Amino acid sequence: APYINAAFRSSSEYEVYFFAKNKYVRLHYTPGASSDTILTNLRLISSGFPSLAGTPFAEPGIDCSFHTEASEAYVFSGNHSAYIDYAPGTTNDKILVGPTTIAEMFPVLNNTVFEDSIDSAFRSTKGKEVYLFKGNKYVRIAYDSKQLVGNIRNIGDGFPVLNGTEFESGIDACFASHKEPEAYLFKGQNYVRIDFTPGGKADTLVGNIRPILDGWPVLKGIFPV
């Protein structure tokens, strides 16, 4: 039971979506402060995103997601994917593409460890790049061309600061902060903050690791879900 199974940052400034099982919350956050606030109380994914009702993303829920551009995002559940427009503040949310399987959405992932499911992913600052994580492996993909960038690598090799930590063999969830170029990584009950610089994964800065319920105290008594 990882506390947070998926996360992606909103088109709304300093807002983020955290998913756990078939449910989610929408938070307003402030880097540097423990002052985070719930804007949308824990509820069914299908309630917050009606276009997802009757799909793997509603039940059992979203296990990986990343922000792309505008109010669009990629979501996953097992071996399934959808490109969606969540249209913040309106009844106009919709699936642009899918549901389809991961390999159908991204043929470059066919016959890889990513085909059957993806642990987590976050939006890079460079071009249209996105970091995908599955076990102890990661790879960058450009979401527009849908082509891979670089080789599939061990997290520990691509990110030496994460080598030896609990993130080395996997990342349960993560998202790109509105404060660039930072990201948050989540593993089990813990999380950490990073400062990354595209191309130079080796030059990643990492903070000390903390329990989720201490860094985001507002989730206390709500998470684990």
Cα distance between residue 219 and residue 225, in whole Å: 10
Of 27, 64, 149, 155, the one binding Cl ion (CB under 5 A) is 64
Classify burial at 92, counting beta carbons within 10 Å of its beta carbon; exposed 0-12, middle 13-18, buried 19 or more: exposed
CB 177 within 8 A of CB 125: no
Residues 151 and 139: beta-carbon distance below 8 Å: yes
Please tell me whether residue 63 binds Ca ion under the rule CB under 5 A: yes
Contact between 81 and Cl ion by CB under 5 A: the answer reads no
Complex with Ca ion: residue 86 or 133, whichever CB lies closer? 133
For the window 3-32, what string marks contact with Cl ion as x by the rule CB under 5 A?
A: ---x--------------------------
Nearer to Cl ion, 16 or 221 (CB): 16
Q: For Ca ion, give the closer residue by CB, 5 or 46.
A: 5
| Choices 29-37, 56-64, 70-78, 131-139; region in contact with Ca ion by CB under 5 A | 56-64
Specify the length of the chain in residues. Answer: 225
Q: With CB cut-offs between 5 and 8 Å by kind, which of Ca ion, Cl ion, Na ion, none does residue 201 bind?
A: none
Q: How far is CA 18 from CA 117, 184, 196, in A?
A: 18, 12, 21
Burial degree of 111 (CB within 10 A; 0-12, 13-18, 19+):
exposed
Residue 77 lies near Ca ion (rule: CB under 5 A): no
Window of 29-37, 77-85, 120-128, 152-160 that interacts with Ca ion by CB under 5 A: 120-128
Residues in touch with Cl ion (CB under 5 A)? 6, 64, 120, 173
